Design a protein around this nucleic acid. Structure first.
Ligand code: SF4
Ligand SMILES: [Mg+2]
Length: 187
RNA sequence: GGCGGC
DNA sequence: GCCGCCAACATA
């Protein structure tokens, strides 16, 4: 039901901070390192894209990287299809959970994957939070949680703020959950 | 990105 | 250089 020329907006309204960053990095650089391609690609599949849309979405953005639209089909296409279970063993991989994103494959320079509340240093997180136009009160309420290592809670706090609600009404532990609960309120 | 094949 | 096959796992 979801369409491609609708993602840029969705990233702002319903994507949790991690996926939002990942999308922005993708649009600005026209590319993403492995870690991000994994985290974001499966998220996109979790929200609804089909294999046709995924290949389109990724190809389109990588051509802007000015690379051979063939060098794309060469490497990148097979792996996208394998994500959707259409190659090898044929496993329709479930998208990543929070605990996994937070406790594993920590990001390095050049990477945008991971959990902002956990991998972005307090000072850079605050700037992001401010860029998302989050009230200095909640931003302060989030940083606290972060300092207490309650990353998922800090994210729920971010959810409640961009949605103008008192209680998100669910315990967060998976990015696509954050998306669904958001779409519930907006759509 | 890793592992694997030439 | 060319190429294949992997990982995940919430979820009302
Ligand atoms: S808490 Fe879970 S969802 Fe919110 S950002 Fe960290 S990872 Fe993405
Ligand atoms: Mg590569």
């Amino acid at each position: 039901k979801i369409s491609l020329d609708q993602i840029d907006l969705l990233s702002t309204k319903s994507f949790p901070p991690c996926m939002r960053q990942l999308h922005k990095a993708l649009r600005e650089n026209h590319h993403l390192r492995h870690g991000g391609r994994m985290q974001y690609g499966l998220f996109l599949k979790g929200i609804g894209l089909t294999l046709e849309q995924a290949l389109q979405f990724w190809k389109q953005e990588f051509i802007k990287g000015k690379m051979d639209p063939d060098k794309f089909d060469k490497g990148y296409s097979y792996n996208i299809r394998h994500s959707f279970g259409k190659e090898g063993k044929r496993t329709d991989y479930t998208p990543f959970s929070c605990l996994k994103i937070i406790l594993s494959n920590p990001p390095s320079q050049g990477d945008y994957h991971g959990c902002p509340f956990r991998h972005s240093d307090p000072e850079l997180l605050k700037q992001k939070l401010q860029s998302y136009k989050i009230s200095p009160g909640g931003i302060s309420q989030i940083l606290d949680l972060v300092k207490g290592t309650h990353y998922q809670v800090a994210c729920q706090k971010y959810f409640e703020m961009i949605h103008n609600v008192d209680d998100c009404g669910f315990s967060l532990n998976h990015p696509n959950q954050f998306f669904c609960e958001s779409q519930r309120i907006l759509n």
